[PDB]
Amino acid sequence: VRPKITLACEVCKHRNYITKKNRRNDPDRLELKKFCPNCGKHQAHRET
Amino acid sequence: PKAKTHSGASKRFRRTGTGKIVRQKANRRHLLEHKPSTRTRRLDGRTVVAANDTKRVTSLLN
Amino acid sequence: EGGQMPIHMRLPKLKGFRNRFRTEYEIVNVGDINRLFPQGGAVGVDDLVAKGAVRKNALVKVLGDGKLTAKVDVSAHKFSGSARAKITAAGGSATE
Amino acid sequence: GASSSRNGRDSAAQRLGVKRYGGQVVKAGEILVRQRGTKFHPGVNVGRGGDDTLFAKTAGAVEFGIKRGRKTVSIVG
RNA sequence: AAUAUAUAGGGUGCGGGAGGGAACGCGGGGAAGUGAAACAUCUCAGUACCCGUAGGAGGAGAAAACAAUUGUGAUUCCGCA
RNA sequence: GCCGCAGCGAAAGCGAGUCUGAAUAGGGCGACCCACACGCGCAUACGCGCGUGUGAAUAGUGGCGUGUUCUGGACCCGAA
RNA sequence: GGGAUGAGCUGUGGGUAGGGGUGAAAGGCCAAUCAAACUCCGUGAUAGCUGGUUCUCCCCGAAAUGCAUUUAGGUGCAGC
RNA sequence: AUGCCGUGGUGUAAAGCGUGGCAGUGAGACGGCGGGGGAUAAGCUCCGUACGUCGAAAGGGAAACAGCCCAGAUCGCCGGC
RNA sequence: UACUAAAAACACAGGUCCGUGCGAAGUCGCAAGACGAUGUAUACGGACUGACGCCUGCCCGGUGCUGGAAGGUUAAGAGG
RNA sequence: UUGCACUACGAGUAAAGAUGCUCGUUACGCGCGGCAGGACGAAAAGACCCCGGGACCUUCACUACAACUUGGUAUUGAUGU
RNA sequence: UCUGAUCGUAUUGGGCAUCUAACCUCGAACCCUGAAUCGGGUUUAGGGACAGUGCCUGGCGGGUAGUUUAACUGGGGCGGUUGCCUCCUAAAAUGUAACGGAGGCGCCCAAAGGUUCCCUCAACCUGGACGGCAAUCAGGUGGCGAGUGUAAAUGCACAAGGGAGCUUGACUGCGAGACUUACAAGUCAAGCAGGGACGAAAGUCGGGAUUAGUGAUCCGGCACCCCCGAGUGGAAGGGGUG
């Protein structure tokens, strides 16, 4: 019910981050601004 | 005959230029989600074998 | 260690591999060309062996530790970057 | 025999308490009072910490005192 | 011979084999106790034992060889690596 | 042939440095003599930088002896 | 004391061999030994277990606690 | 109250610390004091104590009496306290 | 039960069930071969009750045994 | 069988049941026939109990193998439908 | 020429039936054979591409074989327990045992995180339509008796408790110096740089008031980096980072 999701970038698609969400409270994939070390700046991040 | 070296401990320890015996650090292979980045950075790199272990570790490399 | 997981199984393996094709070079500094050859001249790979500065039948490589004041014309494999400077700063040369 | 091991368990002692006392020269970063909560409060040149650890920010001598009821840990620089 | 071509089998005369030996050799069969602080993979160990079969020794051997851009040029054995 | 002669790094590789890193940021590992004269930016006298020494103390490796350890039955005796 | 014309007792000769024989069944018997015989070899089997370990003097001198353990009468590391 | 950490004086040879060689030990016992278990029973059991002794400590005293009190045997003496 | 147990234990004639159509089934053997048997279902082997008299009730869910093959799952080989 | 030997008893004390220690009490030295209370008498490195190892036995504990058995393929062919 | 049906020639595969020549017979006769219930050969009578065996493959398999079957324990068995977190025992630092006395944990939260600004509660007293001991309202008294996602302790009213706007630092590259410690581990960390969030600024932010919500190594899986690439160029595989 609390799986480990991974957060890939939206420009270079590198899987930079891993965290946990709830699956019944959040059926759709998270979107967060996080730092991308390849791009050198904050990009968007969805799940996979 | 001839003294065989321990094949396991020679894949885990090595020597520097002066004679210190370095090693890596545990707890950094899996189950890395709940470990914050202040912990996975403390376990990064190499450290010196402690002063109490360095007799048995030397005798397994020789 | 009495039963527990010992020091050579608690700890992870050292990372990486060992290169099968690594070519090692034997080391002479340019601060040893000064002390062994103060009159200068030709410094061959065979001349460094007989003076005891380097081993037999191996590839030499001149590095740049120390001062150089003599005027030497040294032939070697793979000169360093900072050793072509100190050799030509006295009037010599460096050929492969 | 009545198996009255209904309660036979404990945690590990956490080594809390005051670690550098008064009039004692410290370095930058030395942990002064490790504790649960703010039994002691940060004063001058003392930061709190993530689990209320009360380290040091500047070398000097440690002195304790009172600041409106809440007792403080300070460092004379 | 049955059965015809013929063979199986029989008669006669020449040569040879069998068995033994302390170790060594080559081909084949092949444990366990033990070690793993238990044990099954693995070890012990292709060891003990066993079978075939030699020779004064045997086996191997005259490149479907290595090597890596120059090269070495049958095999066996010892020292290194 | 072995050991000493340069190290760092997973390795390519570079080398009194080197790996990590965007970093002329910081750390890890490794090198690196002020007890004195002099010149010099110049420190109150005291020292960073840099030349000649006053001529700083380095150093390994092969035998033999001894203590311990390793592979073997391994200090000796003893099963079912 | 039980059988004593019977599923009787007995002589001589022969057969069955070790995870096998034989058993009107007790794990009985198989050369004074049997819940897997004897002899030789692997073999100087292994034993965290018990026992033993030989001349002298001089100086210093403990521990029986902590941590972990298929660990609790063993052992590693720390303390001394 | 004690104990504990820091610092400034003073005192004390065989104290402390770093790094190597070689260990043994990891079954403790009783006594004083503070406690848990037990019936505030045990020569009972489990902990604390810069507490002691035995273990590894002879000599004197407690009739005898590892653990209590006094005292620490280098050797000699038909000397004193 | 040779060597502490002779019994109520084992055997037994009698009973039932299951196996076997004949170099049988079962057993000793890697095989050939043998016993079974110079026997042929009124015989032979396996299991359990144990002269004789009166009798032997109910349960096919569980695990076996025998027979069946509708559908489910399932190896190598073919296929590529 | 046996460490010794000019080997009493009571009430004690001690590894908690003393010929050997303490305080007492009793006993002339040595033999021969008897008795069996103690010498924790003699014999068997406790068979019970626990700890470590071993054996053999069981089963719907684990992993294997003999035997029995399935299908493919070789031995393995021809003509029909 | 394509979807679909049908027909024809050739090739090959599966069933069923027949055939004989491989193979099979402890059916018979004859011969080696003088003496033969063995054996082989010839002929005949039946079976027949089945059976048997070889290689591959699934099933069943105490019939047999090698071994495991935990420790703690006021003797063993039976019962109970084993790791992490909080209290007391615990003798006013730290630490401290027993099958001593009490309880919790193997999570939950996309806001219950970051920041900025504002607020003060429970209980009680008086008044009030349905309305009651206690819903909502108004006023007094009230300094913490309420509250904190979750156990207890230490905290917290200056709020870490109640409310709202914007957000993603629930970051990447690191880290002087310390706590704890046999070792392996565990804990805290000012500050520097990149790139951000809130705020007028100062500044605070590397998850949550704090301490549990976990698992060494080995062997594998995926994404990325393009480091080695067994003659060379690739590839296979290995390596690093997450």
Ligand SMILES: *C(=O)[C@H](CCSC)NC=O
């Ligand atoms: C139990 O007492 C007994 C032992 C023999 S007498 C000490 N067990 C079996 O015989």
Ligand SMILES: [Mg+2]
């Ligand atoms: Mg939501």
Ligand SMILES: [Mg+2]
């Ligand atoms: Mg990894």
Ligand SMILES: [Mg+2]
């Ligand atoms: Mg991480």
Ligand SMILES: [Mg+2]
């Ligand atoms: Mg374990």
Ligand SMILES: [Mg+2]
């Ligand atoms: Mg606690």
Ligand SMILES: [Mg+2]
């Ligand atoms: Mg936190």
Ligand SMILES: [Mg+2]
């Ligand atoms: Mg011969």
Ligand SMILES: [Mg+2]
């Ligand atoms: Mg074995």
Ligand SMILES: [Mg+2]
């Ligand atoms: Mg074995």
Ligand SMILES: [Mg+2]
């Ligand atoms: Mg073993």
Ligand SMILES: [Mg+2]
């Ligand atoms: Mg052993």
Ligand SMILES: [Mg+2]
């Ligand atoms: Mg020859």
Ligand SMILES: [Mg+2]
């Ligand atoms: Mg290296």
Ligand SMILES: [Mg+2]
């Ligand atoms: Mg550096």
Ligand SMILES: [Mg+2]
């Ligand atoms: Mg010698």
